[PDB]
Scaffold this active site. Structure first.
Site, PDB file in Angstrom:
ATOM      1  CE  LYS B 161     -19.206 -43.196  38.180  1.00 18.08           C
ATOM      2  NZ  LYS B 161     -18.736 -44.430  38.826  1.00 18.08           N
ATOM      3  CD  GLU B 187     -26.390 -43.838  41.060  1.00 15.44           C
ATOM      4  OE1 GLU B 187     -26.039 -45.031  40.980  1.00 15.44           O
ATOM      5  OE2 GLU B 187     -25.581 -42.890  41.019  1.00 15.44           O
ATOM      6  NE  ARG B 188     -27.018 -51.668  42.145  1.00 17.60           N
ATOM      7  CZ  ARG B 188     -28.113 -52.101  42.749  1.00 17.60           C
ATOM      8  NH1 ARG B 188     -29.281 -51.552  42.451  1.00 17.60           N
ATOM      9  NH2 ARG B 188     -28.042 -53.087  43.631  1.00 17.60           N
TER      10      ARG B 188
HETATM   11  N1  LIG Z   1     -10.179 -45.634  48.616  1.00 15.29           N
HETATM   12  C1  LIG Z   1     -11.530 -45.668  48.667  1.00 15.29           C
HETATM   13  N2  LIG Z   1     -12.249 -44.795  49.391  1.00 15.29           N
HETATM   14  C2  LIG Z   1     -13.582 -44.809  49.442  1.00 15.29           C
HETATM   15  N3  LIG Z   1     -14.314 -45.711  48.787  1.00 15.29           N
HETATM   16  C3  LIG Z   1     -13.742 -46.677  48.025  1.00 15.29           C
HETATM   17  C4  LIG Z   1     -12.277 -46.690  47.925  1.00 15.29           C
HETATM   18  N4  LIG Z   1     -11.937 -47.707  47.128  1.00 15.29           N
HETATM   19  C5  LIG Z   1     -13.084 -48.303  46.740  1.00 15.29           C
HETATM   20  N5  LIG Z   1     -14.157 -47.697  47.263  1.00 15.29           N
HETATM   21  C6  LIG Z   1     -15.523 -48.173  46.982  1.00 15.29           C
HETATM   22  O1  LIG Z   1     -15.985 -47.497  45.820  1.00 15.29           O
HETATM   23  C7  LIG Z   1     -17.377 -47.251  45.953  1.00 15.29           C
HETATM   24  C8  LIG Z   1     -17.767 -45.943  45.305  1.00 15.29           C
HETATM   25  O2  LIG Z   1     -17.509 -45.957  43.917  1.00 15.29           O
HETATM   26  P1  LIG Z   1     -18.198 -44.755  43.136  1.00 15.29           P
HETATM   27  O3  LIG Z   1     -17.531 -44.577  41.805  1.00 15.29           O
HETATM   28  O4  LIG Z   1     -18.342 -43.623  44.112  1.00 15.29           O
HETATM   29  O5  LIG Z   1     -19.689 -45.295  42.950  1.00 15.29           O
HETATM   30  P2  LIG Z   1     -20.085 -46.330  41.804  1.00 15.29           P
HETATM   31  O6  LIG Z   1     -19.132 -47.454  42.098  1.00 15.29           O
HETATM   32  O7  LIG Z   1     -21.538 -46.635  42.055  1.00 15.29           O
HETATM   33  O8  LIG Z   1     -19.856 -45.562  40.530  1.00 15.29           O
HETATM   34  C9  LIG Z   1     -17.656 -47.188  47.442  1.00 15.29           C
HETATM   35  O9  LIG Z   1     -18.915 -47.796  47.733  1.00 15.29           O
HETATM   36  C10 LIG Z   1     -16.507 -47.914  48.103  1.00 15.29           C
HETATM   37  O10 LIG Z   1     -16.931 -49.153  48.661  1.00 15.29           O
END
Ligand SMILES: Nc1ncnc2c1ncn2[C@@H]1O[C@H](COP(=O)(O)OP(=O)(O)O)[C@@H](O)[C@H]1O
Ligand SMILES: Nc1ncnc2c1ncn2[C@@H]1O[C@H](COP(=O)(O)OP(=O)(O)OP(=O)(O)O)[C@@H](O)[C@H]1O
Ligand SMILES: Nc1ncnc2c1ncn2[C@@H]1O[C@H](COP(=O)(O)OP(=O)(O)OP(=O)(O)O)[C@@H](O)[C@H]1O
Lengths: 51, 479, 501, 478, 145
Positions: B161, B187-188
């Protein structure tokens, strides 16, 4: 004929294995849903009547 | 006077008393000041929600409980809190109470809109329905946004996300010449920091010269109190509000996370003498989402398009905060632990994610047929997959054995790389055009490219590049 | 030597004392029950002041009402008379800090529970020093090393990045924590193994292993006896955090190991419950989120303006029956920098460490790991995710495609590369070696179950024959053609050596 | 001698006592109440404080049956924490929740006594050696080695042979090594307490005459007891054990069963203490009380207090906090899955979660380490195949996976240790096995020496040569 | 009727009386066993006593715990089921064998009250509705009994 008899006994055991498995899993679901929502209710009522 | 005592402090809930001459209204900013552990002139800002009789009131503080001690002075501003808003208030990152936290020069604090305000009635809401394309494949195919709508990122346990928001901001902030604003709401902080670094990099902040920054960041910490976090969304929303009425431009909001805000509200409501609710939250959840999703409305005066991340805990939907958040959303993107586990990103199950702007007449009646065919074969595969897992694909009959492999190619094809995610993938991403999307899918769903290997569709921006990667894969099958 | 010199120091300590004009807030203790002290009076008491009793079992004032003050018993006060003059200390839970801590088992009241002797210490580190600022801090751009293979392979840890180890019990969580501690032997990395709420025999075992491995020369173990009061059992991670702040604030980048954090939430829950501060969901107080937020956000990476160090964090949280939908492993996954799992299945099935990257994820990526491993196998994480799905898919193995047969045997051998023996922390250059051995398909033709032997033979062969490779690449962090050449060369040689035989 | 006065409130088990305003007693100390009865006004009402509650009033926990007493009884502050007889006075004597000998023997000599609870032993006073001794029960000796001086956790629900497994373990180590063997019964079925007491009398490890030659201190606390008594018997038994590890300086065998009943007594008394509840129902302080009862067990610098604690996992719920604290707090988790007993194995122990940190190559030998490995990999794989083989039948596997299922069930029935005390329950006089068995039965199973004898041919037989002879007999009977 | 003294309150009775009834049965059984004779007490059904005591607790507003039952219920049942033993010839070797009937729900032996009273008894005695509708009357399942 023997191939589609072995498939028939494969399905005639798999259907009953699926039936006993859904029986156990249904009982597991009922117990789990019961336990979760009871813990929910008693927790929120503890928080609500703790005033 | 209006100087009162703070009778009880329990967490970020502060029972303030007052003489019977003055007992202020709700939502008003109160500032205990001048004290800290170092004898510092440290102030704490605290707003009021419940006023518990005898001219006394329990407040929520937007900074930490440390510092201030019961039986201390407090200066209510005789008004609800007001956020410094303006084009001078772009560029810099600032606090929930508005103080520039960028630690260089403070913005000119002259035009402060009150943080709690009226929500626009639908006589002012721009009922003009519109279509938005954002270059990400599965979204602009199957969950096409409203250029004007409200956009939801139903995310799972930290999956795709926030990186999706970073990619999408990167793709559309330059696109929308009107104003834009990220609201970092619980947010983090290091990933909000990474986002801020990417805005410094891509020059949307224009670090060498500001207030030409059409983006404006406001952030509230996780580590900040829930009194801060339960109003930081209101801060960002009011900045967008000022730009949507006074500036009345095209305004873009990217708050993250709204569920952080929900949890903070629940958090203080447990403390400030109120009952619990159904699992998770406060009993004021629906009205909180009411205030928010009634104030973020594209107005007949000025448009707005707010995207927002919704982290559901336990990665479900029956959870009550997403049970009302769906009801307050119009462009819903629901991510999946399963599609993240298979690496497919953005890990949106297209089954759950829909949009009001997926009407055939409004997307093109062939684009709609594309969308229907993909959703059909996809959902049938997601049905079939457990029967596969027990009886074998090679058994599972041919008229569906073609469709399982077809939709299996489909989802991985609509996994497309991002220009920031290349740190996680290896190849720099792609900004895909929707004509290219519907073209490639009109190949796949029809069954023209059923000759290709499936992993040729893995993580590929365009279908011609998928044919290219397919030739590369066949070449390495020789070599 | 005793009583023969110390009399002059006795005179020095006596003469020149304060005789202060210190007006203090002082409270008559009203209601002590079960680790708390709801105290009457005591008006101007700062929430968070230590409050000195009759005993000396001091206490933090957490909550406070118009009449009473919710005060805990850091140190269980087993005999406190009602109405005792329990005055505060004025100061707010400050912590003394020095580099002379480097090895002493230390208690949460900064006290050496090593048996090594008391520590001189100057500063008074606050217990709630906030997070480092938003603008002030840089992205995690620099690698920090695991010593374990698969984590640095797919799901990188970085200096300043706060990866979250997670998993069920008895699956090597503390083990991989200590392994990635005593990996740090020349990386100028302070480790702070904050042990929380478990067997003191276990913490004695880990300090025994640290005395074996030498790593207790620089690491700081904050122990927490399970018999310690729950106020102390939740306080101690804040002490470890501020202590690591003491070194990160100079320049010195550091690492911390909370172990665990779920007992921190439980102990803190117990304190809040006895404080009658009402519970949120799952009978926890709601703000365990806020507690762990304040904890983990005090762990980040400095920038050049203030010291460019880092406080990479490893808070282990314990989840029962492999759940994620437990409340604390639901908060900490949102407030961590990605999470890694230790499935009981993958541990007991030989994958040791047990980080199934299907559910495991590191959310800052390659920018916090080395450019050599980047340029080699950035893609290998997603390749292995597909191999995991397709191997679940290859349950229906009747007529596999030849290309998917290659892919499945490929990722099979790759997973076999991600096997490693107990506490064998490979050189990061050796991780580059095995990662290129996997990604360049040399092992594809080779024997599939002797890949471990192929790897130990290959690493011995390169570490003997061409040790110039690992040093030139560790000086350049970059997978260049020289690295390629030396690699494929020793690959031909040792492939011959293990083909014959 | 100390403050006399009046109990102001009695609420079932718990009681609230007022006092002279000058000096309230300690927290955690004891005090008797005289009170009344039918005949005589005995000091049977021992009591223990819990919470000084305002208005010179202490809220306190009872220790015995607490009817007949009333508000305003002549309470006697004994000032000190609850003392308890220690020494050779313990040896053999079946004494009770406050130390008085309820074995219908003499009132033991109070010349050596000790308070009920004390501080935790020191970071240094922990031992260093990862001590291991075997028992004779082969599944344990394969995949859950036992940290002697550490903690040996017995999990499982009810009706799964946990107390019986404890009876077998004590049936071995009563005449095996170890000095004084302090059994404690926390909430035991008292007929079963006297049962194993009679097993000690018959087995002679305890002494009929000259009882001070016992190296056995069976201080039970029966399940019938009030919640204060159940809440305290664990502290009594551990006071005996630490007394011996500090004064006998002895390796003390510390069978206790089952401390879930202890913490449930804690939950029950908290619910009348008015302390708010916790996860699903228990006291909020379960963590700290389990921490007390664990951290005051240690292998000292001289006394390796080997503790064999059972925990009644309620309704087979591993995510319950009463397990979730203990098998963080102990070394050798041994969960006894009920479904294995439904299948009919006795003991009914899974390999997957029943584990140890003793299972290390540098402790058990790398050979025994990989022995336990090559068992555990196969059986975990068998479970991973089990949950999809039960649906849709046997032969949809590979030849390999079929053979692996056969060999995994081989190990499974092979770990069916016939118990030496279970002869009177089942019929088979049980067997003793050791380390040559521990290597060789595994070796024959995993090599494929025994690879044609059926699943019954290693069923309920410990020794693998005994399994071979059983195979000979069943092949002969055709 | 000379062999028994039937104790009967029904579901009309308040949960307090239904809670006290098996205690009274155990008390008079203690008098009779205590007077040198063997005796046999038939609690029927003890799960109904658990429900009654749970109600009495909730009207006493005591916060219930596991499965919304109070934590007391184990000690509660331990009272009226540990008063049932065989004495020795020290006092007349009377015996108080007991059949506490516990009607479980759907075979959920891992439900709180059944696993509780299993944790206090001298073993299970099974009865499956499946063997009952399988014509085998009585329907005791000897593989688990
Ligand atoms: N298939 C994928 N494509 C892109 N990013 C991925 C994937 N699988 C895991 N990630 C990881 O997930 C993280 C993003 O998670 P997200 O939900 O966007 O943010 P948060 O983890 O802070 O909620 C990215 O930093 C990335 O390292
Ligand atoms: N690479 C490895 N190879 C073999 N065994 C390993 C490996 N890593 C960890 N283990 C094992 O995992 C076991 C459990 O260790 P550890 O205590 O860290 O697990 P845990 O889940 O943290 O348990 P607890 O939470 O109770 O401390 C140890 O005995 C250790 O040998
Ligand atoms: N190892 C065993 N050998 C023989 N019979 C057994 C065994 N385990 C269980 N049983 C049968 O099951 C009944 C109850 O099981 P078991 O005695 O194991 O529970 P338990 O030991 O009372 O559990 P806990 O002591 O934890 O309450 C016994 O009476 C016996 O008939």
């Amino acid at each position: 004929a023997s191939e589609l008899a072995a498939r028939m006994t494969a399905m005639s055991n798999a259907t009953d294995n699926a039936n006993e498995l859904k029986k156990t899993l249904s009982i597991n679901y009922n117990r789990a849903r019961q336990a979760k929502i009871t813990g929910e209710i008693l927790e929120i009522v503890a928080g609500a009547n703790a005033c | 006077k209006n100087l009162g005592r703070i009778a009880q402090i329990i967490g970020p809930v502060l029972d303030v008393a007052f003489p019977p001459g003055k007992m202020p209204n709700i939502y008003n900013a109160l500032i205990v000041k001048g004290r800290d552990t170092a004898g510092q002139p440290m102030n704490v800002t605290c707003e009021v929600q419940q006023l518990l009789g005898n001219n006394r009131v329990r407040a929520v503080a937007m900074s930490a409980t440390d510092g201030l001690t019961r039986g201390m002075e407090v200066i209510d501003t005789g008004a609800p809190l007001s956020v410094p808003v303006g084009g001078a208030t772009l560029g810099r990152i600032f606090n929930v109470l508005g103080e520039p936290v960028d630690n260089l020069g403070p913005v000119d604090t002259r035009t402060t809109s009150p943080i709690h305000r009226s929500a626009p009635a639908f006589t002012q809401l721009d009922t003009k329905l519109s279509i938005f394309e954002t270059g990400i494949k599965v979204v602009d195919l199957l969950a096409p946004y409203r250029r004007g709508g409200k956009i939801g990122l139903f995310g799972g346990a930290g999956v795709g996300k926030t990186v999706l928001i970073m990619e999408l901001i990167n793709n559309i902030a330059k696109a929308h010449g009107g104003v834009s604003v990220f609201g970092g709401v619980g947010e983090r902080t290091r990933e909000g920091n990474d986002l801020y670094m990417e805005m410094k990099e891509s020059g949307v902040i224009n670090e060498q010269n500001i207030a030409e920054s059409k983006v404006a960041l406001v952030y509230g910490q996780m580590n900040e109190p829930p009194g801060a976090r339960m109003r930081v969304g209101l801060t960002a929303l009011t900045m967008a509000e000022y730009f949507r009425d006074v500036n009345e431009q095209d305004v873009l909001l990217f708050i993250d996370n709204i569920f952080r805000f929900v949890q903070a509200g629940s958090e203080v409501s447990a403390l400030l003498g109120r009952m619990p609710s159904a699992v998770g939250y406060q009993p004021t959840l629906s009205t909180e989402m009411g205030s928010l999703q009634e104030r973020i409305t594209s107005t007949k005066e000025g448009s707005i398009t707010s995207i927002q991340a919704v982290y559901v805990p336990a990665d479900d939907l029956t959870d009550p905060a997403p049970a009302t958040t769906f009801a307050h959303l119009d462009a819903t993107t629901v991510l999946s632990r399963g599609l993240a586990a298979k690496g497919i990103y953005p890990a949106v199950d297209p089954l759950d994610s829909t949009s009001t702007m997926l009407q055939p007449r409004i997307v093109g009646e062939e684009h709609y047929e594309i969308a229907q065919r993909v959703k059909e074969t996809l959902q049938r595969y997601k049905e079939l997959q457990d029967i596969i897992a027990i009886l074998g694909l090679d058994e599972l009959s041919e008229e569906d054995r073609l469709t399982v492999a077809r939709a299996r190619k489909i989802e991985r094809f609509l996994s497309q790389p991002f220009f920031v995610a290349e740190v996680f993938t290896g190849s720099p991403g792609k900004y895909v055009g929707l004509a290219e999307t519907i073209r490639g899918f009109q190949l796949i769903l029809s069954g023209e490219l059923d000759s290709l290997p499936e992993q040729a569709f893995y993580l590929v921006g365009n279908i011609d590049e998928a044919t290219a990667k397919a030739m590369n894969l066949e070449m390495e099958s020789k070599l | 030597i005793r009583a023969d010199e110390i009399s002059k120091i006795i005179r020095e300590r006596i003469e020149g004392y304060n005789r202060e004009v210190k007006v203090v807030n002082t409270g008559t203790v009203l209601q002590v029950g079960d680790g708390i002290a709801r105290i009457h009076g005591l008006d101007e008491v700062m929430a968070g002041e230590l409050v000195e009793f009759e005993e000396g079992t001091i206490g933090i004032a957490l909550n406070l009402e118009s009449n009473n003050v919710g005060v805990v018993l850091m140190g269980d006060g087993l005999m406190i008379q009602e109405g005792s003059s329990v005055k505060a200390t004025g100061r707010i839970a400050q912590i003394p800090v020095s580099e002379a801590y480097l090895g002493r088992v230390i208690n949460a009241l900064a006290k050496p529970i090593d048996g090594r002797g008391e520590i001189t210490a100057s500063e008074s580190r606050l217990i709630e020093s906030p997070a480092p600022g938003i603008m002030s801090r840089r992205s995690v751009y620099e690698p920090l090393q695991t010593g374990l293979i698969a984590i640095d392979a797919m799901i990188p840890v970085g200096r300043g990045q706060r990866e979250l180890i997670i998993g069920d019990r008895q699956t090597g969580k503390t083990a991989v924590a200590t392994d990635t501690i005593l990996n740090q032997q020349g990386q100028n990395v302070i480790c702070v193994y904050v042990a929380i709420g478990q067997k003191a025999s276990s913490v004695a075992q880990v300090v025994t292993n640290f005395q074996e491995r030498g790593a207790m020369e620089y690491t700081i173990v904050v122990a927490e006896t399970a018999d310690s009061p729950a106020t102390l059992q939740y306080l101690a991670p804040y002490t470890g955090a501020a202590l690591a702040e003491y070194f990160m604030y100079r320049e010195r980048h550091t690492l911390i190991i909370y172990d665990d954090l779920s007992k921190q939430a439980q102990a803190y829950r117990q304190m809040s419950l006895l404080l009658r501060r009402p519970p949120g969901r799952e009978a926890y107080p709601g703000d365990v989120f806020y507690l762990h937020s304040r904890l983990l956000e005090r762990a980040a990476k400095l920038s050049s303006l203030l010291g460019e160090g880092s406080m990479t964090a490893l808070p282990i949280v314990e989840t029962q029956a492999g759940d994620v939908s437990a409340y604390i492993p639901t908060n900490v996954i949102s407030i961590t920098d990605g999470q890694i799992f230790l499935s009981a299945d993958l541990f007991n099935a030989g994958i040791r460490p047990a980080i199934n990257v299907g559910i495991s994820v590191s959310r800052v990526g390659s920018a916090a790991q080395i450019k050599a491993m980047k340029k080699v196998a950035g893609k290998l994480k997603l390749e292995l995710a597909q191999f995991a799905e397709l191997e679940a898919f290859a349950q229906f193995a009747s007529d596999l495609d030849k290309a998917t047969q290659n892919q499945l045997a490929r990722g099979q051998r790759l997973r076999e590369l991600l096997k490693q023996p107990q506490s064998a922390p490979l050189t990061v250059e050796e991780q580059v070696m095995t990662i290129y051995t996997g990604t360049n398909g040399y092992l594809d033709s080779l024997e599939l179950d002797q890949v471990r032997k192929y790897l130990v033979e290959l690493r011995t062969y390169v570490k003997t024959n061409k040790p110039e490779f690992q040093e030139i690449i560790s000086s350049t962090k970059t997978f260049t053609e020289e690295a390629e050449a030396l690699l494929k060369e020793a690959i031909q040689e040792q492939m011959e050596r293990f083909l014959l035989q």
